[PDB]
Design a protein around this ligand. Structure first.
Ligand SMILES: Nc1ncnc2c1ncn2[C@@H]1O[C@H](COP(=O)(O)OP(=O)(O)OP(=O)(O)O)[C@@H](O)[C@H]1O
Ligand SMILES: [K+]
Ligand SMILES: [K+]
Ligand SMILES: [K+]
Ligand SMILES: [K+]
Ligand SMILES: [K+]
Ligand SMILES: [K+]
Ligand SMILES: [Mg+2]
Ligand SMILES: [Mg+2]
Ligand SMILES: [Mg+2]
Ligand SMILES: [Mg+2]
Ligand SMILES: [Mg+2]
Ligand SMILES: [Mg+2]
Ligand SMILES: [Mg+2]
Ligand SMILES: [Mg+2]
Ligand SMILES: [Mg+2]
Ligand SMILES: [Mg+2]
Lengths: 50, 124, 119, 55, 49, 402
RNA sequence: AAACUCCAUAUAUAUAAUUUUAAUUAUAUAUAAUUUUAUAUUAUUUAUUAAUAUAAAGAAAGGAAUUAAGACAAAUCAUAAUGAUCCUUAUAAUAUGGGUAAUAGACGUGCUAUAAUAAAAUGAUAAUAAAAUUAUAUAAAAUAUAUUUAAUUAUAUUUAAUUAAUAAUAUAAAACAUUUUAAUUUUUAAUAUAUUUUUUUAUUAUAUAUUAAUAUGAAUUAUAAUCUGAAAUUCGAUUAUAUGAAA
């Protein structure tokens, strides 16, 4: 069954790149929070996939 | 002759593997179950606050699409949250091979059976 | 604008913080005691104060050593050092550091503030 | 914390007596520390070696 | 563009900016057009080997 | 000005709470919450009734940081092990004094909102203290009352009294005729200069009139004592007294207020603290036998040995400093026979129901719907949420863009 | 010279009566890679070949040390040592105090800061480390004072355990959650209002100045107390109250 399933992607390349550009001083958690909160606000105004 | 003996489940059906990342170490007990996880006796959301650390632990189970087929009792010590979460990730991948040795190639290809060697280097 | 003893305060300013900011000799601990004594709740603001309460603050402020009186005490302690001819007194007269700081470099603030008639 | 201080002081005094300890309830500086410090003279005075070497 | 908005929280300013861009309005499309105009002018300067 | 009428100027937590972002949500038709017909709604996501929404908004049952803006109106999953279990004990137990516990984000506030919804349906008068920190943080006025020997807080009491009036059915309040005559100072800006006082005669005026008395700030403490006394003497209508974030009270023995000697004021020296603990301890007894007292802790507050000892979970350690153990609160809680109800974590079937509702609400990302098998999603989200934590489940679905 | 090697990493054996517990460990020995294999493609000096991709196997991904020659007659006679030359009641030796800490300008290297992708509080069945140190010691808990219920911080009193995989220095910190935050009328308050209630809306009041220094910043300075020492004046460290510069 697994032979025909692609290995799931570890991470999203674009989101990881955007997060690291926001990040400073190694504070990745803060950077991920800012992006997720910003994308959460985009969904709540557009109601589409941010 | 060789020094390798086939790994097998113990008397309680548990696969025990050890993993290391940075200064952290993790000893996990994997048994067939329904997806229950305990880290040092604590809930996963309690011990690991970062969702990215939780996702790293789940990745090996996501590769073999067996996230709801095993109960994990992970014990970890040393380093910080990232080292411990990825040390558990490495140990779960090594413990899952006993349940089905045919999936080792998929685990190796995903990169979860490789021990990360990077550690803090004294400046030279 | 609320005026207490000449000082002007913006309405939004918190009383305990404003008092320790505009009045010489009153710090954070002293300001909190004044507010506690007058029945002002911890985070009350200036615009809330009534005229009877503004007079009560001025009364309590007038029974303390603040403003000129407090500044005079510092000016008189510095003058005494010069009068007795102590090493520290000379430093104040020469506009040099008085607490052992090196002078080969830096010492800029002591050059602007150290004086017998210290502000 | 609810144990009366008088009761806890009686225990401290008796305990100190049994264990030959100095009981100073007031807290006055007594110099007992000076009387208990170790003598470092012998170690300090041997820094440069034993002087009674064959010459 | 986000840092010109009024919110004290960067997440709010970033969210608002991303919402406006997803709805078509953005002042950075002018920057892109000006970078592409310059490149079209210097098309002959390309080497192609 | 830099701020325009519609500009989002607040921080993220307040913007999501206040920016009315649910307006764009898609209207869904869900069953209504009714405990009398729980059999038809058990283990299903339900909305509240129109009468329940109005009361719960005035009580403060819905709070910020609950992802309520994702849906047109706040919704709740009727659970068997949390909602049905707790509500059955509330209807059967004779004491009816409970404290809701559980790990942070497990759903303690939602359970309390479901108890408020039940009370509204069952014709009860709800007195809710949503955020006790408001009367302990020292950010509103306080005054000492000589006749009560307590520190009254007029600003806070005015807000509380209006909430009790706007959140409860006027008919229920009108049914409770007054038992004593009351006189207060008149602060109504219409006849205050004509009528020095407003009199409330017994058997003629009701508790509804008492909740509409406009008095001076210095006499507002005596109005709160009358309202509680009138509601504690009547036996017609059950009174449900609730306090969310009660852990704040247990861990803040001394408020931020300071007396005239710059000494912090003990929380039980405030009328709000004394009133709250009199109802919990049993000093203030309610005549009606269906009256209840439901308390809920919050994970945003610090923990110490006070609550565990009061609940009998650990032995009493006398040498614990007062900052980590308040023996007076333990005595009051144990005098009231308060019982603990721990909110369990969600099971995998309950996670399936919540994620199936989220799919219909269009709140799930495209990475969890396209190219992923439904069974895999449920297993992954049950693992990433700590095996049931509702708050970690929502964050994994709507607040994890990695 | 490279290397061989040692280290790290992976694994095996041995050792521990698994309470010196970290067996998820410790440290002796040995093994392992300078990875290997096939497959298609592209070039070639086309062959018993390279560059790529592809599948397969594997834990496998990083470091070290030392020198061969020569130059700057580069630094050091102040780490110590040698020749020459000079001093020998002094250029040698000891004690007291002072200086090496002076202050116009200039230069190098650092620390702190100039606020909201960032600072400040709080988080006790105590989120989560590593490597070191303790017989010329490391100092627990407790109590007392600053000081207030307590906590926190500082010191005193007292001196438990450990000379150590045992006890102590020492509950790592950031993180994360909540609260707060001048500039900012983006606030607060009084009424009324709401199906946003830790909140919305309405009407009033909430300052003036202002390219600017605040609830940022912590230099400077007054006073009191403490710590080490025989001794803190030139010239040490810490705390409290007050001061609050430049930026
Ligand atoms: N039964 C439920 N149905 C739907 N959502 C729920 C339910 N229980 C909890 N949630 C959601 O889980 C999150 C946390 O809920 P809630 O705020 O009630 O938890 P809590 O334990 O009281 O939180 P805290 O520890 O912060 O006080 C919210 O997003 C809430 O909407
Ligand atoms: K001042
Ligand atoms: K000097
Ligand atoms: K310099
Ligand atoms: K000297
Ligand atoms: K700052
Ligand atoms: K000195
Ligand atoms: Mg809650
Ligand atoms: Mg062990
Ligand atoms: Mg020098
Ligand atoms: Mg600072
Ligand atoms: Mg710990
Ligand atoms: Mg101690
Ligand atoms: Mg901690
Ligand atoms: Mg911190
Ligand atoms: Mg400051
Ligand atoms: Mg300036």
């Amino acid at each position: 069954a697994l032979k025909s399933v692609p290995i799931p992607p570890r991470k999203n390349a674009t989101l990881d790149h955007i997060t690291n550009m926001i990040m400073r001083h190694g504070k990745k958690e803060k950077a991920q929070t800012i992006l997720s909160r910003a994308l959460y606000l985009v969904y709540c105004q557009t109601r589409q996939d941010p | 002759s060789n020094n390798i003996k086939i790994k097998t489940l113990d008397e309680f059906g548990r696969s025990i593997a050890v993993g290391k990342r940075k200064s952290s170490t993790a000893k996990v007990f994997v048994v067939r179950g329904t997806g229950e996880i305990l880290v040092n006796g604590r809930q996963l959301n309690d011990y690991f606050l970062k969702m990215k650390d939780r996702e790293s632990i789940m990745y090996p189970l996501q590769v073999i699409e067996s996230v709801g087929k095993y109960n994990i009792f992970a014990t970890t010590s040393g380093g910080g949250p990232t080292g411990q979460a990825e040390s558990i990730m490495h140990a779960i991948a090594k413990a899952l091979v006993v349940f089905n040795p045919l999936l080792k190639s998929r685990l190796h290809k995903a990169g979860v059976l490789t021990r990360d060697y990077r550690h803090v280097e004294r400046k030279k | 604008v609320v005026h207490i003893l000449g000082k002007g305060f913006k309405g939004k300013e918190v009383i305990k913080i404003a008092l320790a900011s505009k009045f010489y000799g009153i710090g954070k601990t002293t300001a909190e005691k004044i507010c506690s004594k007058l029945g002002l709740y911890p985070w009350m603001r200036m615009h809330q104060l009534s005229e009877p309460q503004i007079m009560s603050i001025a009364s309590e402020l007038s029974t303390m050593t603040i403003e000129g009186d407090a500044r005079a005490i510092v000016k008189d302690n510095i003058a005494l050092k010069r009068k007795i001819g102590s090493y520290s007194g000379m430093r104040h007269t020469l506009h040099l550091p008085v607490r052992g700081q090196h002078t080969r470099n830096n010492a800029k603030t002591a050059r602007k503030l150290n004086k017998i008639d210290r502000r | 914390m609810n144990v009366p201080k008088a009761r806890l002081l009686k225990v401290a005094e008796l305990s100190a007596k049994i264990f030959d300890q100095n009981f100073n309830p007031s807290g006055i500086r007594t110099g007992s520390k000076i009387l208990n410090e170790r003598l470092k003279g012998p170690s300090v005075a041997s820094y440069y070696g034993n002087p009674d070497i064959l010459k | 563009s986000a840092n010109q908005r009024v919110s004290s929280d960067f997440a709010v300013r970033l969210g608002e900016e991303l919402t406006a861009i997803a709805k078509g309005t953005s002042s950075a499309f002018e920057k892109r057009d000006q970078i592409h105009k310059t490149a079209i002018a210097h098309r002959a300067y390309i080497q192609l080997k | 000005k830099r701020v325009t009428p519609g500009s989002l100027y607040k921080n993220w937590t307040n913007t999501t709470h206040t920016a009315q972002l649910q307006q764009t949500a898609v209207p869904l038709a869900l069953p209504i919450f009714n405990f009398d017909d729980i059999s038809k709604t058990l283990n299903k996501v339900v909305s509240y009734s129109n009468k329940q929404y109005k009361s719960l908004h005035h009580l403060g049952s819905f709070k910020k940081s609950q992802f309520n803006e994702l849906f047109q109106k706040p919704v709740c999953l009727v659970r068997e092990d949390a909602t049905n279990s707790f509500l059955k004990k509330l209807v059967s137990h004779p004491v009816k004094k409970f404290i809701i516990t559980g790990e942070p984000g497990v759903g303690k506030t939602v359970l309390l909102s479901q108890a408020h919804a039940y009370a509204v349906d069952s014709k009860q008068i709800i007195i809710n203290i949503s955020y006790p920190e408001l009367f302990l943080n020292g950010r509103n006025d306080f005054s000492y009352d000589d006749d009560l020997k307590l520190f009254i807080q007029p600003m806070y009491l005015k807000k509380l009294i209006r909430k009790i009036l706007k959140a409860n059915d006027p008919a229920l309040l009108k049914s409770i005729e007054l038992s004593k005559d009351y006189k207060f100072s008149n602060a109504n800006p219409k006849n205050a200069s004509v009528k020095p006082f407003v009199t409330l005669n017994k058997t003629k005026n009701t508790v509804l009139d008492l909740l509409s008395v406009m008095t001076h700030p210095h006499n507002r403490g005596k109005l709160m004592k009358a309202i509680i006394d009138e509601l504690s003497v009547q036996s017609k209508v059950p009174i449900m007294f609730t306090v969310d974030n009660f852990s704040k009270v247990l861990t803040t023995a001394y408020s931020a207020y300071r007396n005239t000697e710059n000494k912090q004021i003990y929380s039980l020296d405030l009328q709000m603290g004394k009133l709250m603990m009199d109802i919990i301890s049993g000093e203030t007894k309610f005549a009606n036998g269906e009256s209840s007292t439901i308390l809920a802790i919050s994970g945003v507050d610090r923990t110490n040995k006070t609550l565990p000892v009061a609940l009998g979970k650990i032995p009493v350690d006398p040498y614990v400093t007062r900052y980590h153990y308040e023996p007076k609160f333990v005595e009051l809680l144990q005098k009231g026979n308060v019982t603990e109800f721990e909110v369990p974590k969600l099971n995998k079937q309950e996670v399936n129901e919540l994620i199936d509702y989220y799919k219909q609400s269009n709140v799930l990302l495209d990475k969890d719907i396209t190219g992923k098998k439904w069974e895999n999603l449920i297993d992954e989200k049950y693992f990433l949420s700590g095996n049931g934590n509702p708050r970690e489940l929502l964050k994994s679905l709507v607040l994890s863009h990695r």
